[PDB]
Structure 1
């Protein structure tokens, strides 16, 4: 359904749909705010569903699930020149642990989305974005500040959920739409046992193939250096149809944020040069236009921004207020952003392609493909260049 050697992935993530992220849909979290006090806002989906109870959580999510992404967005994605979508989903859509507060029902919408993808000639990756116990402690895993994916039976339950995803979506029914099943989004390499993580990856790889599936297995890089996975899941060991997913951003640390625009572009070009050297097919599964960490709650509910020196002990760079609204952006920030997007697009098209995070946000412009495209900051057509050849690839 896809030629990783010849075609280039040009997609967007359908984030904030099946896994709630506070910075993407702040209106679902804001009702819990007491005036200016943010101490009572649930910090993740786990706490959001627990605080609401099953009845209200199901009513609010059914409304979110049915309106956040619909068939019209798939038509729009296709009309903009995109050929792929990445769909994050948490383990709770398939199985609940005893005492889990999550509600189900996401599957019905996942299946509707696969038919919309088919109708619009869009290919997809199904991404297991959150595992039981949390694989990274991020709010996008469903459970913030916990790192227990490798404790107790959490790894085995993840494998059972993947077996379900393998039997339903890795067979012949969706062979023309599904071009990858991503085993686990962002396992936080530095706090996990890497040997157990590789064993988990190998177990998922073997389990999928054992079902008769030929679907590409996508492994996230677990924040390891470029080339680290060169010797794992290789054709020399009879392991094939494997893709490495790299996520790239330059706003999650004081050092990265302080770079001038030329240095940000140099780093983006370098991502293109180093990925070219890897031996596995690779795709930049997540990246954005963000040059700051100013979007409200991007670092998590009740956490400020490093950009204005209000978090993770970073120095003050500038005020975030003026960057919250794209209509207030200075002419220089608009040019810097377009330059940054074009450098990234060239670097990722140098290898397997790219998937922007994300299609839409309620009001965070740096993270919304729709908003940037409508304001002329994201090239349209996507091959358009106002700043051609900033990297000099050969």
Structure 2
């Protein structure tokens, strides 16, 4: 349903939909603030559902699921010249651990989305974004500050969930829509046992193929250096239809944030050069326009921004308040943003293409494809260049 050799993915993530992220939908979390005190705000979906209880969580999430993304969004995505969406979903949509606070019902909307994709000629990855125990301790895994994916029976439970996804979505029923199943989003390589992670990836690969599925298997790079995965899941070993997903940002450390715009561009261009050298098909599955970490709660609930020297012992670079509203951005910041977007687009189209994080946010413009497009900062058509050939690819 896709030609990974000849076609380029031009896509958006449907983030914040089936896995809550505080920075993307702060309205769901802000009612728990006590004036300026954020100490009682649940930090992740696990604690949000636990605090509300099952009845309230289901009422509020049903409303969210039914309105956040609809068929109209898919029409607009097609109209903007995009050809692809990535759909994050948590393990809890399929299976609950014994005392899990999570509520279910996401699957109904996932299946509506697959139909909306079909109708609008949009292809899809399904992405397992959160595993039991957490694979990364990020709030976007569902469970912040825990790293227990490789503990106990959590890896086994994850493989059981994947087998459900494989039987439902990796077969003939959706072979015209689903062009990849991503085994696990952003496993935090540095804190994991990498040998066990590779075994997990291999078990998932083999399990899918054993169902008779020919669906591409997408592996996230686990924050390893470019080329790390070249010798894994290879044609030499009869392993085929494998894609590596690289994520790229320049905002989650003081060193990255302090780069001037030219150096930000040089780094983006180098992402392209280095991805080209790899031996698997590869796609930039998450990236954005952000040049700051100013979005409220981007680093987590009750954590500040490195950009204004309010987190992670970073030096003050500038004040975030002026940057929260795209109408208040300086001409220079708008120009820097457009340059940065174009350099990333060129870099990522140099291999398998790109998937912007994310389609929409409530009020975080750096992270919203819609907002950037409407304000003329994301090229429309997406091939438009105000700053052509910044990287010099050949």
> Structure 1: 5+ residue runs without aligned partners?
none
- 2:322 and 2:309 mapped to 1: Cα distance? 15
Secondary structure of 2:11's match?
Answer: strand
- Counterparts of 1:38 and 1:20 in 2: how far apart (Å)? 18
Q: Whole-Å Cα distance in 2 between the matches of residues 122 and 221 of structure 1?
A: 25
CA distance in 2, matches of 1:335, 1:138: 31
Q: Partners of 1:339 and 1:140 in 2: how far apart?
A: 28
| 1:171 to partner: Cα distance | 0.1
CA–CA separation in structure 1 for the residues paired with 2:235 and 2:66: 42
Note the C-alpha offset of 1:66: 0.1
Q: What is the CA–CA distance in structure 1 between the aligned matches of 2:375 and 2:186, rounded to whole Å?
A: 31
Structure 1 residue 68 displacement after superposition = 0.0
Tell me how far apart the structure 2 counterparts of residues 318 and 136 of structure 1 sit (CA, whole Å): 29
Say which SS state the counterpart of residue 108 (structure 1) adopts. Answer: helix
Scaled by the length of structure 2, the TM-score of the pair is: 1.00
Return the offset for 1:87. Answer: 0.2
TM-superposed CA distance for 1:260, in Å, is: 0.1
Rounded to whole Å, the distance in 1 between the matches of 2:160 and 2:207 is 10
Aligned position for 2:201: 201
Helix, strand or coil for the counterpart of 1:159? helix
1:285 equivalenced with 2:288 (yes/no):
no
- Any idea what SS the aligned residue of 2:35 has? coil
Shift in Å, 1:69:
0.1
- Residue 204 of structure 1: CA displacement? 0.1
Shift of 1:78: 0.1
Corresponding residue of 1:315: 315
Q: Deviations over 1:274-308 (max 9, x none)?
A: 00000000000000000000000000000000000
Displacement after TM superposition at 1:3 (Å): 0.2
Structure 1: distance between partners of 2:299 and 2:138:
9
Shift of residue 326, structure 1, vs aligned partner: 0.2
TM-score norm. by structure 1 comes to 1.00
How far did 1:201 drift?
0.1
Q: Deviations over 1:47-79 (max 9, x none)?
A: 000000000000000000000000000000000
Q: How many residues are matched?
A: 394
Displacement after TM superposition at 1:356 (Å): 0.1
Distance 1:157 1:169 in 2: 18
Q: Distance in 1 between matches of 2:70 and 2:194?
A: 39
Q: Deviations over 1:109-133 (max 9, x none)?
A: 0000000000000000000000000
Question: Which runs of at least 4 in structure 1 moved beyond 4 Å after TM superposition?
Answer: none
**CA-atom RMSD in angstroms:** 0.1
Please give the secondary structure, in 2, of the residue aligned with 1:66.
helix
Following the alignment from structure 1 to structure 2, what is the Cα–Cα distance between the partners of residues 65 and 235? 40
Distance (Å, rounded) in 1 between the aligned partners of 2:152 and 2:392: 50
* Distance in 2 of aligned mates of 1:27 and 1:253: 27
Deviations 1:341-363 (A, max 9, x none): 00000000000000000000000
